[PDB]
């Protein structure tokens, strides 16, 4: 419910709706197939049909600890709880704040973490861009 949190889409802007202000739970009704970009969060979605996506803000501290497995991985972007119907989402672009303009960061060292019920899954991105990583056919 604000011009700052709009998604840019093929038929113009689509407004994010607040579902729970105190828990940072939001919702967007993408009106048709195509590519949508939210500059406020850095999220992009490529969808195949109209679909409702809801998006919660999370903290890694609940999920990522200093364990023998997780210790060698650094937080590189925000953590989102995303829910959308299967088969509707071609790709999600998850933002990251690592600078790649200098040839200092190997792109094969990026992963998408996915914290399911039985523990952390580590997903090699389809590709890594300057400010986001792409996950194809996500099962949220």
């Amino acid at each position: 419910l604000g011009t700052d949190d709009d998604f840019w889409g093929p038929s113009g802007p689509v407004s994010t709706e607040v579902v729970d202000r105190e828990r940072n739970l939001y919702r967007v009704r993408l009106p048709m197939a195509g590519s949508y970009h939210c500059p406020s969060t850095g999220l992009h979605f490529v969808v195949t049909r109209a679909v409702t996506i809801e998006i919660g803000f999370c903290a890694w501290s609940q999920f990522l600890h200093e364990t023998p497995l997780q210790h060698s991985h650094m937080v590189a972007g925000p953590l989102f709880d995303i829910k959308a119907e299967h088969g509707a989402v071609t790709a999600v672009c998850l933002p990251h704040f690592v600078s790649l303009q200098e040839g200092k960061v190997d792109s094969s060292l990026f992963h998408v973490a996915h914290f399911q019920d039985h523990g952390m899954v580590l997903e090699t991105p389809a590709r890594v861009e300057p400010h986001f990583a792409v996950l194809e056919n996500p099962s949220f």
């Binding site: 940072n24 406020s40 969060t41 850095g42 919660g56 803000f57 999370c58 903290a59 890694w60 501290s61 999920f63 990522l64 060698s72 991985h73 650094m74 937080v75 590189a76 972007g77 925000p78 953590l79 989102f80 709880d81 995303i82 998850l94 933002p95 990251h96 704040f97 690592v98 600078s99 303009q101 200098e102 200092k104 960061v105 060292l109 990026f110 992963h111 998408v112 973490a113 996915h114 914290f115 399911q116 019920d117 580590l122 997903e123 991105p125 400010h131 986001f132 990583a133 996950l135 996500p138 949220f140």
Partner: protein
């Protein structure tokens, strides 16, 4: 379920890598005097959101100004300074990632009356070069 981007560390490099940072400026006008809170944080919408909410509880509201244009290194340190005579506490900020659930480091800048406007600066502590500034003027308050 929850998802986001991780970067594998290299022994040579560790946590202190180059990142896109954002400056966040908040003000409170109380009586005739203005106080600024200046944050320097990774470009992370969940961090910016938690700071917005914490600052709003104390009636501080964000003023938009462009962020530093160069990538900055995690752990690098910056000196906060100003054109006008002002009280700054602390004078030094460190760029680091802190979870949106923890408090964030900021510099408090008590200005007094704003007058014509005030120029806030961030300078690399190491070699003293200017990395960022903003001109804050009465019209920016709105």
């Amino acid at each position: 379920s929850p998802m986001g981007v991780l970067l594998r560390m290299i022994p040579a490099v560790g946590h202190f890598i180059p990142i896109t940072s954002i400056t966040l400026i908040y003000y409170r006008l109380y009586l005739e005097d203005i106080t600024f809170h200046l944050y320097l944080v990774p470009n992370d919408c969940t961090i910016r959101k938690a700071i917005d909410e914490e600052e709003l509880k104390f009636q501080f509201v964000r003023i938009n100004k462009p962020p530093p244009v160069d990538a900055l290194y995690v752990g690098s340190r910056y000196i906060v300074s100003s054109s006008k005579e002002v009280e700054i506490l602390p004078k030094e900020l460190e760029l680091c990632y802190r979870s949106p659930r923890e408090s964030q480091l900021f510099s408090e800048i008590y200005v007094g009356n704003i007058g014509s406007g005030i120029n806030l600066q961030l300078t690399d502590k190491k070699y003293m070069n200017l990395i960022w500034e903003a001109l804050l003027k009465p019209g920016d308050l709105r």
